[PDB]
Design a protein around this ligand. Sequence first.
Ligand SMILES: CCN(/C=C/N(C)C)C(=O)CNCc1cc(C(=O)O)ccn1
Ligand SMILES: [Fe+2]
Ligand SMILES: [Zn+2]
Length: 442
Amino acid sequence: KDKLNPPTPSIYLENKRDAFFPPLHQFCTNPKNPVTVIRGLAGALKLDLGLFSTKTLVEANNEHMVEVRTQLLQPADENWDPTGTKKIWRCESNRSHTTIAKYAQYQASSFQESLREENEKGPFKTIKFGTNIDLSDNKKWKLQLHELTKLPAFARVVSAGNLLTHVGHTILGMNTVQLYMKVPGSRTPGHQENNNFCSVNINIGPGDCEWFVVPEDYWGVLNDFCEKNNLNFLMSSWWPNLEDLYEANVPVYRFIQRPGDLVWINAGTVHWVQAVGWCNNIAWNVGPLTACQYKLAVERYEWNKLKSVKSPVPMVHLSWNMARNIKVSDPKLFEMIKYCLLKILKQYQTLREALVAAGKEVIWHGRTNEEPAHYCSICEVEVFNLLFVTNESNTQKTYIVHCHDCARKTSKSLENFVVLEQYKMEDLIQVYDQFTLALSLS
Ligand SMILES: CCN(/C=C/N(C)C)C(=O)CNCc1cc(C(=O)O)ccn1
Ligand SMILES: [Fe+2]
Ligand SMILES: [Zn+2]
C-alpha cells in the first residue's frame, strides 16, 4: 500500500524570515514527523557551504584524522551478499584511518576516474567513506563553527533549548560537529542516534545523498529482523532489505538531500543513508525540551544497560542539571523528570543507608564545576554521587570509578574500596524540592 511509502515531511525555505518562523521548529519537533527535510536552508540563510568544501578543509587542517570505512559499492537501494546471489542485511565494512589530505586525494581522483570511465549480481567494486571527522576544536575550525551559529536557535550545536547544552560537558559528535567526506555509494548503515537524540545533518555538496527513514515506533521490528539474521541492532553494520520491510508493513520514508538541505532526524527515528554523488556532510545532535525527547532518551538509556552498551548521554547527571538550572513549564516533561529524580534519590538513599548500616565510611569528596559525569570503569554504567574507588587509586588520586555492583563483585565486603560522595543528601533533596512546574500560558 502507499501508506507504506509515505511522503517526506518537507519545508521549503526562501529567506531568513522562513528560517526564523516559529512554526518551523514546532514542525521539526512534532513526534508526528519522523524526519523533516528543510530544503534550501543554506541558501535562505546565506550560509557559506564553501567553508566545508574539501579544498577548504585540506587548507585548514590537512593532517586531521579521518575514520575510513572500506565498503562495497552496491546498486541502488540494495545490499547483496558479496557472491551476488541474495540480498542480506549484513554489510561488509573494514575500518582504518587516514588524514583529510589523503582522503581528499582519493575523493578527487575517484571523480576523475568516473569521468574517464564515462568516456569508455556483482562482483562489486570497493570504495572508501571518510567518516566521523572531529570538528570540536574551535582553534582549528573557528570559521567553520562560527558559520553554524547563523542557524535558528533550535538547530544550533549550542542553545538554551538544547538538553545537550545542559549536560555541561562535551559529548563527542553530539554537542560537537562531525564531518563526513564521501564518494558515490558511501553508506551510513541502519541506526538510531545515541540515546535517541534528535540529529541535524547538512549536505555541503556538490552531490546528493539519499535517505531512508523508519519511524521510531517500528524500531522493534527492525531489532527483531536483526536478531533473526544474527545481527546486533545497536552495534553491527546492517542495510535493510526494503522488500522485507514492506512485507512487514513497515513504512519507509525515502528522499534526496541536496546541497544546502538540512535533515532533522526526530527522536528515535531509524535511518540509513547513502551518497549518490561526491559530497561532504556535517552533523550533530540536539535535544529539544519535549516530553517525547526525554522519554525516548530515558528508555534507550535503560535499554543500553540491558544490552551492556555505554550511553554517551549521562541521563542521571543531565536530569539533575535540568532540575538545578532549567525552569520547566511543560507539565508532562516536568512529571517525567520529577519521577526520574525521585527514583534516583530513593535508590541513592537505600544504597547509602546500606553502606552506613554495614559500618562502611562515606568520604566527603565533592566535585569540581563542569566535571563530567562518571561511568563505571568495568561495566560502563553511569555512576552518580557515590563513587567506589580502590584504596590504591584513592591513594594515587587517580579516582578510578566503579559502580557498587562491580566493586562488590571484586571485593566482597568492599574492603578494597573507599566510598566517595560528590553531593550532600540535604543538597540533592533541596534541588528536588525546589524543582517545580513553572507556569507558561503558551
Ligand atoms: C551510530 C551513532 N553515531 C555515532 C557514532 N559515532 C560517534 C561513532 C552517529 O553519528 C549517528 N549519525 C550518523 C549519520 C551519518 C550520516 C551521514 O553519513 O551523512 C547521516 C545520518 N547519520
Ligand atoms: Fe544518524
Ligand atoms: Zn560497574
